[PDB]
Amino acid sequence: TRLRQRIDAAVAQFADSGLRTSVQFVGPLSVVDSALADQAEAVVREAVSNAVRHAAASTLTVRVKVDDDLCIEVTDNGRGMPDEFTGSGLTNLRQRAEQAGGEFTLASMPGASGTVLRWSAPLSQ
Amino acid sequence: VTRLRQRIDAAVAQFADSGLRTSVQFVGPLSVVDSALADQAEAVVREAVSNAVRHAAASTLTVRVKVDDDLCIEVTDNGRGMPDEFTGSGLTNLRQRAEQAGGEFTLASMPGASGTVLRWSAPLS
Numbered sequence: 001t002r003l004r005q006r007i008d009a010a011v012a013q014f015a016d017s018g019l020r021t022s023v024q025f026v027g028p029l030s031v032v033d034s035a036l037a038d039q040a041e042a043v044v045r046e047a048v049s050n051a052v053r054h055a056a057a058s059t060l061t062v063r064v065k066v067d068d069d070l071c072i073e074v075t076d077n078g079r080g081m082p083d084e085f086t087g088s089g090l091t092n093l094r095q096r097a098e099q100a101g102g103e104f105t106l107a108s109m110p111g112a113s114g115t116v117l118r119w120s121a122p123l124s125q
Numbered sequence: 126v127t128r129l130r131q132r133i134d135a136a137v138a139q140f141a142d143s144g145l146r147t148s149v150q151f152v153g154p155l156s157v158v159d160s161a162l163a164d165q166a167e168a169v170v171r172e173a174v175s176n177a178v179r180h181a182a183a184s185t186l187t188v189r190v191k192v193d194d195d196l197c198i199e200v201t202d203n204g205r206g207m208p209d210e211f212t213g214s215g216l217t218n219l220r221q222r223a224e225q226a227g228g229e230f231t232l233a234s235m236p237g238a239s240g241t242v243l244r245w246s247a248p249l250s
């Protein structure tokens with residue numbers, strides 16, 4: 001499937017050139033089947049593409065962890081921009097979570113002090 | 126715990142010329158790396174990143190940290206037209222640390238997209 005490579009590529013391709021990025025892989029990425037890898041790649045593409053430049057320098061931190069399940073967590077320390085992540089990209093993350101029998105959360109810290117997107121799905125379901 | 130992941134991210138963010146795009150990637154069990162080697166890894170990243178310059182075109186520095194049989198730190202710079210970049214005393218410093226840690230160092234340059242690759246590695250014990 002080449003999952004690790006596809007995720008690094010999606011980040012390089014889709015992250016606004018004004019953002020710093022950091023991607024960590026944890027656990028056996030090989031354990032992910034081709035259909036779920038397809039989901040994982042699209043999820044990272046959606047999250048990263050929807051990130052925008054902020055008033056100050058900011059980083060998107062992506063963590064892709066395969067352990068009991070597959071867990072993709074994107075942390076954005078950029079502030080403000082209340083419309084960031086709220087549109088069709090969010091529809092698509094929720095739809096992909098539903099297709100995969102998984103879960104999606106978007107959470108924004110006090111006065112928009114950073115945002116976390118977490119998409120998870122069972123490895124087998 | 127060494128806080129290796131966080132310290133590498135901070136080294137890049139803090140020491141990269143602010144005109145460069147940065148991308149950090151992590152693979153393997155980072156927690157396995159000892160405190161002394163984590164100290165080395167951090168210093169290697171700061172030195173390498175601090176030596177990157179602005180090119181005539183926009184450019185990206187990608188730092189990949191991989192833990193398997195050994196610790197491997199690869200800095201890829203797609204910038205062109207600065208053949209003096211990364212040569213000089215910063216390279217001696219990297220080679221010195223490689224020698225001290227019982228590891229290897231490579232500096233490779235080629236035409237096209239992966240213009241320069243700096244690779245520093247050291248055994249875990």
Ligand SMILES: [Zn+2]
Pocket residue numbers: 051052053054058076078081084
């Ligand atoms: Zn953002």
Ligand SMILES: [Zn+2]
Pocket residue numbers: 177178179180184202204207210
């Ligand atoms: Zn350069």
